[PDB]
Design an enzyme around this catalytic site. Sequence first.
Site, PDB file in Angstrom:
ATOM      1  N   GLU A   1       5.332   8.337   1.948  1.00  0.00           N
ATOM      2  CA  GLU A   1       4.214   7.579   2.486  1.00  0.00           C
ATOM      3  C   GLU A   1       4.502   7.101   3.916  1.00  0.00           C
ATOM      4  OE1 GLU A   1       3.317   3.602   1.725  1.00  0.00           O
ATOM      5  OE2 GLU A   1       4.820   3.376   0.077  1.00  0.00           O
TER       6      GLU A   1
ATOM      7  N   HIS B   1      -4.958  -0.367  -0.069  1.00  0.00           N
ATOM      8  CA  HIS B   1      -3.644  -0.752  -0.559  1.00  0.00           C
ATOM      9  C   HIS B   1      -3.417  -0.172  -1.935  1.00  0.00           C
ATOM     10  CE1 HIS B   1      -0.187  -3.867  -0.760  1.00  0.00           C
ATOM     11  NE2 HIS B   1       0.117  -2.965   0.134  1.00  0.00           N
TER      12      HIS B   1
END
Lengths: 110, 90
Positions: free
Chosen positions: A73, A102
């Site tokens: 990520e 998120h």
Amino acid sequence: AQVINTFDGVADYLQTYHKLPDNYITKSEAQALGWVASKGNLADVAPGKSIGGDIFSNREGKLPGKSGRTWREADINYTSGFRNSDRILYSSDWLIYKTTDHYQTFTKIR
Amino acid sequence: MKKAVINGEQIRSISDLHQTLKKELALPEYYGENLDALWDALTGWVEYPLVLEWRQFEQSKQLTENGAESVLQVFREAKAEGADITIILS
């Protein structure tokens, strides 16, 4: 080079060159340069860098799993201060997703 | 440094647990209330040192299904990763 930190920009860079653009640093690298998450001083200690490159354990199992596939990520839209909720997620076999909430939800972008 | 407390007997869903965590760890208003959101907060947001006191663990497992153990595990990995986290289970 100029910072590349937008969904398309990083997405295309990852597919084409199989690496993140040069403005990304892992959490550990950042910490060795003096990053203190709670202070939000990443641009002070690592100017023009963003957090990106660490393993993504896909803990909610929302991204597609495969034997042999690991994910990573990287932060997107970040410039300075406290981190945001945008991330780009990319696998060992170059599948590319994003999230702007998120990690609640993910969209496949490559 | 930072102290967080979970009164497990007051946890009535996994939503309660995440929302308790959001307050106790001073998490972002965008906190995603998920396992991936917590790892990221634990490794890229939270102020350390961190002491987590999780009381009545067993009761908090009743209405969180598998969530209480999953959440716990995220803190333990965060701690295994180098985060300065003390965990107190009562």
